[PDB]
Each structure stands twice: as C-alpha cells, then as structure tokens.
Design a protein around this ligand. Structure first.
Ligand code: PLP
Ligand code: PLP
Lengths: 365, 365
C-alpha cells in the first residue's frame, strides 16, 4: 500500500445544515454536544484513502463489521483551549498520537503517520473553531477513533478500517468555578485490567465492563471507582483517571507518588505532565511506585497523607476526600491541607493551556 | 427482569433480489458469506420496538455510539442443521439465549424475553431456510448481537440499544470428515482473562486483544493459542474453544477432565454437552478440575495422556497433537490413541444434530 494518508489531500465538504451553537443557560454536558464537521479516513488493501473533513453524519457499517463483534476499536481524548487572544491551542497532542498508534498496533489495525493525523485534526479544529468556548474552564474535546471494519465474522486482522474524529465543546465537568472533591468506592472484587492484559491501551473493550461497576459505586454512595489490583490491593486508577498521592512516606521523606507503568495503568498525558512539572520544581521527591491500601491506611492514621487526587483530560486535577474501603469510610484530608499541590498544579496548567505563558507543550490552532 | 419485545409482532419485509446461494464443491470461508435476511430490534426509553426481519443491509450508527467507543457489545454463536428430510433444527438454542442474557446484564444492556428471541430467530431462519446447507459437515451459523447505541461519550448505561441477527452458511471444519489435529502455542505471557474479569461472558472486548496473539502463534509455527493462567500455568482454553483432557489421572483412575467454571472460562454449549454426554454413559470419571502444565508434563512422560481436544460450535471436537510450551514441543498422543473418545463424541453429536436420533437437545426449524 501507499505510505499512509496525507493532510495535503484533504477534501473539504462544508455543512449545509449548521448546528445550533450552545446557547441555553450555557449547560455544556460532556460528550452530548457535537460540532458541525468531522474527520473521516478509510483504509483498504489499496491502503489509506484521502482524508476528509465532512459534515457531522452517521456511520454506515456492514452488520458483520469486526468493530461491533470483536471490539476492534480504540480511541483518544485530548483538548483544544482558546486563549484571551482567541488563539486555539492543543495540549501535548503528540503524546496522544503516540498512544493512539500504540493502541492501533496492539489491535492489528492500520498504522498511520502521526504528524499527518495531527495536521488533519488541526484543519478540522480550524474549520469548527467557532465551537471552541473561551469561558473560564471551558475547552474543546477532541475524540479520534480507529475501528476495524471487516465484513467478516472471522476473528482476525481487518483488511478494511475506518478512522474518524468528532468534536465536543465542553465546560469542565461540574464544580465550574471551584474544585470540589469526589468520594471513591474501593472494593477488591472489581478488576479493570491485569498484568499481561491491555489496560495500558485506550481500547473500547476496557470501558464497557466498568459501567456496571460505576453504578454499584453510586448505589453505594460513592461518585467514582478506585480500581484495586492484586493480593496487596494496590491502587491503580480512579474512574478513568490516573491517581496521585502526596504524602510523607515511611522513610519520612515527602513525596508525590503514582503507580508505575507496569501494564495495568493507562499512561495518562496529564499524568506524565504532572510528573514532569513536579520533577522540574525540584522541591520534593517524585516517584512511580506501587501504592497499597495498607500503606494508605497506615499513612492515614499516622497523619502522613496530605493530598490524594486523580488526573485526566476531562478532570485535570481532581481532589479526593473519601474512600469507602472495607465497609469503612476513610476520610482523605485533601481539602484540609489546602489542596496546595493540587492548586499549584491547576494554576500552572491553566497558564500553559490558555496561553498565559508560552510553552512547548502547546500546539497552535 | 424488566421484559418486553414479542414475536407475534414481527414486521416482515422480504428481499427483492435474492443473492445466489454458494456453490456445491466450492469452499465457503466461514463468516464471509451471509444470507438474504436479518433480524433487527431497537430499544430506547420507550422500551423495545417491533421485531423485524429485513433484507441484509448496513447499519447506520451515530459516530459517538457507545458500541464503538466503550465496547458495549456482545454476541452469540450457534448452529442450525438441516437433516436429510430437509428439516432444520437448532442445537440447544436455549443455552445460547441464557448466556446472551447473562452477557446483556453484565454490560447493563436491555433484558429481553429469551423465548421471544428464539421464536424471532426461528422465523428468520425459516425465511432463509434455503440457505441452510445439507452436505455432510455443513450447517448454518447464527450470529445474534446486542450493542449499546447511545449518542454520547459518557461511559454509562445506554438508553438506546440495537439487537440484530445475521446468518452464514458454513462448510465443515474438516474437508471430508477429515478430523485433523491442531498445534498450540502455550506461552504464559499472553493471558486471555482474569478472575474477577469478564472472560466468562461472550463480549466483543474479550476477542480484539487476541488477534495479535494468534498472529504470534502462526509465526511460532502453531495454529492456535493455548491460553494459560496463573502462577501454576493452568490450561484454560484453546483459541475460542474449551479444552478437555482424557487421561489416566494421578490416582490411577481413567477420566475426562476440563477446567471448572470459575471466572476465566467461557461456559461453552458444546462443553456442557460433552460433560452431559460422558456422564450419561457412566463409563469413566467425568470431572471439572483445574489442569496445570505441570500435571500435563508428568502424565505425558508417564504415558497417561490419551486424548486432548478443544470444543466449540465452530469445531465441535478438535484434536490436539502438539503443544509448544517452553520453546519445547510436546507431542500429544491424541491421534495415536485411536482418536477414540473424540470419534465417539463426533458421532453422537452428528446423530443428534442431523436428526438421526430424536433428542430434546434439538429445536425444530
Ligand atoms: C483517558 C484515561 C486516563 C487519563 O489519560 P489522559 O491522557 O491524561 O487523559 C487514565 N486512565 C484511564 C483508564 C483512561 O481511560
Ligand atoms: C464461543 C467460545 C467457546 C465455546 O462455546 P460454544 O458455546 O461451545 O460454542 C469457548 N471459549 C470461548 C473463548 C468462546 O468464545
């Protein structure tokens, strides 16, 4: 096949049926509202077809499409922010393209040029730029997707695939102005991923099984799930966010710790940014190490825990105030210790993402 | 328990240009050929819509459909056999409806009436009766599917879903009652499922990750993957088939063992039928117990292993002759021991499935 698709061959098809732009009491609910256009690229045995920006529209799929029978599907999630200047910028897009390609290979889906995809994405955002909000805390969510599309019930490498990208204006989850903490359910019975599995890839298959578990967290009074793994009940992730703990460890050294990338953790872009940032300050120890409930419990009643939070594109730095472990509620002093670290992290990202401070992390328009 | 969707409400729209059935003597690649009609039922806040048999046609899905982003998809697989009298019968369909409903609940998808679905399926196959082959070893593969279909990027219980069924005429795994054995790759690095996971449900998410692993088996010279689990390397399944071992156990008694239905085993319909059948004979011990490579190695060098095989709808009883474990090829004496048990199982099933012997296991037309 010919290399992979190119931004120079983009075909533009403008919408004739514009969508009404969010205008109510400004109620932006994540993943519900879509912009006017979308990216679409098809892959055959002839290889990749020409990239196309077209009006948002339904997909037409053969009933035996492997994307629907054997979960040959993966996705990404990243944000575009509009600064006061009106300039739109994407936050570390390159990392998302890297991760997306890794996912593609894991599922035997067609490789592509990451810089070519980023360009097409840039062109798509340009076309729908008017959908990018600028109110404090708002942004545009970009959702690239790659699916196998073989008209065959055989479980095998697809010879046809489909890559598309859709956009959603978002208004930052819920609290709006403040930063309210969440409570978590920690029950060892629920398993999200395993060593040797595919938890470290953003594949649709990893999420479907969590819907029921999340419902159990609600019916139990919690807002999200703290995923535990292993006999030692290590803390892997929170909902769909990586987890960080800021405390003074056993050796009495103050540190920021987050589980290591050993197969069951999704390598979050925000996660990597927080480590990079904290490592740059050089004010305290920053490490990737397994974290156990045992260590947490001991640390809690020894008054060593300062802040616990999740990190992810949807909720950059999310405070945790309660963890329901063994029928036992554990209060997490995050807010008591002014979320000092959380607050500094949030300030820094805000400055970087909205262009207040120039940074290599931001990708123009 | 919430029920709905009835068969006496079937809307019916006959094809308009019937495709021509496959060619006698000309092979059919399993799952590549589809019949003229399909079943389609939609679900939303208004509950289940009317069932419909319609011309095979592509699906139209919203780009944010949860079936494509978070793998809210599940499927089933069962066969219809046409006897000599041109009579068509489904093999233990009820078990597939039971399993399908279990899968539905695990993914928070809409519950439905198992008998109502079976009727709609009977009607669909009835309409496509002609597509059911009648040469030895041939049959019709039925592929029911239920997918979430929420136009939202939120990971949550869909408020819309789609249930459909498509049919494929299948050849016969063995060219001419061949019954040739397969070689397997047994590498502990792979891992298909985990205790506490969803390996015991037929969810699309369980299969996507195996494509790459299967390719590695081919490159290593094997035909299928022997899935190992745990520190003790227990044998869980082969490819997409349950595994059975017929041998002289360590206690001196002759037995037919297959792994226990803990969370890492898919409860196969053929698997249950083989256990039922062998228990009915009352000729030897039949047990569900864990099987380790360690046990396999000893029994093997002690000449205690008689036959090893996989079981599944696609390949009812599949002989295994070689297992590539630690870089070391293990010969499995299955064919040497006159393929006794396997041949007896294939014959009994053949008699039951093609109506040679009346049996409660068969469901008419
Ligand atoms: C998306 C996701 C994350 C966070 O990744 P970001 O790239 O920082 O958005 C963490 N864990 C899971 C399970 C995720 O799906
Ligand atoms: C389909 C399947 C089986 C066999 O089930 P049958 O109901 O006997 O067809 C076994 N294991 C896996 C992983 C399967 O997908």
């Amino acid at each position: 096949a010919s290399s992979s698709f190119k931004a120079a061959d983009l075909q533009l098809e403008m919408t004739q049926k514009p969508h009404k732009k969010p205008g109510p009491g400004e109620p932006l609910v994540f993943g519900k509202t879509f912009t006017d256009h979308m990216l679409m690229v098809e892959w055959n045995d002839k290889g990749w077809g020409q990239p196309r920006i077209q009006p948002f529209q339904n997909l037409t799929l053969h009933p035996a499409s492997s994307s629907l029978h054997y979960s040959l599907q993966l996705f990404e999630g990243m944000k575009a922010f509009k600064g006061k200047d009106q300039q739109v910028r994407l936050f570390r897009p390159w990392l998302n393209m890297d991760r997306m390609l890794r996912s593609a290979m894991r599922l035997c889906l067609p490789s592509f040029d990451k810089l070519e995809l980023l360009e097409c994405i840039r062109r798509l955002i340009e076309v729908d730029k008017d959908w990018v909000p600028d109110a404090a805390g708002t942004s545009l969510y970009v959702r690239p997707v790659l699916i196998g599309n073989e008209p065959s019930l055989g479980v095998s490498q697809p010879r046809r695939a489909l890559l598309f990208v859709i956009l959603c204006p978002v208004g930052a989850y819920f609290p709006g102005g403040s930063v309210t903490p969440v409570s978590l359910l920690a029950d060892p019975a629920f398993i999200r991923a395993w060593v040797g599995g595919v938890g470290n890839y953003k594949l649709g298959g990893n999420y479907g099984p969590t819907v029921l578990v999340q419902q159990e967290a609600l019916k139990r009074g919690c807002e999200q799930v703290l995923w535990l793994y292993g006999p030692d009940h290590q803390l892997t992730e929170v909902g769909t966010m990586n987890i960080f703990v800021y405390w003074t460890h056993e050796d009495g050294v103050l540190e920021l710790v987050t589980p290591p990338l050993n197969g069951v953790i999704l390598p979050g872009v925000v996660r990597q940014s927080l480590l990079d940032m904290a490592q740059t300050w050089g004010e305290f120890r920053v490490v990737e190490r397994t974290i156990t409930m045992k260590q947490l419990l001991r640390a809690l009643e020894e008054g060593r825990v300062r802040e616990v939070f999740g990190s992810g594109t949807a909720c950059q730095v999310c405070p945790v105030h309660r963890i329901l472990y063994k029928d036992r509620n554990l209060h997490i002093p995050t807010m008591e210790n002014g979320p000092e670290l959380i607050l500094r992290f949030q300030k820094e990202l805000k400055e970087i993402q909205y262009g207040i401070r120039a940074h290599e992390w931001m990708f123009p328009v």
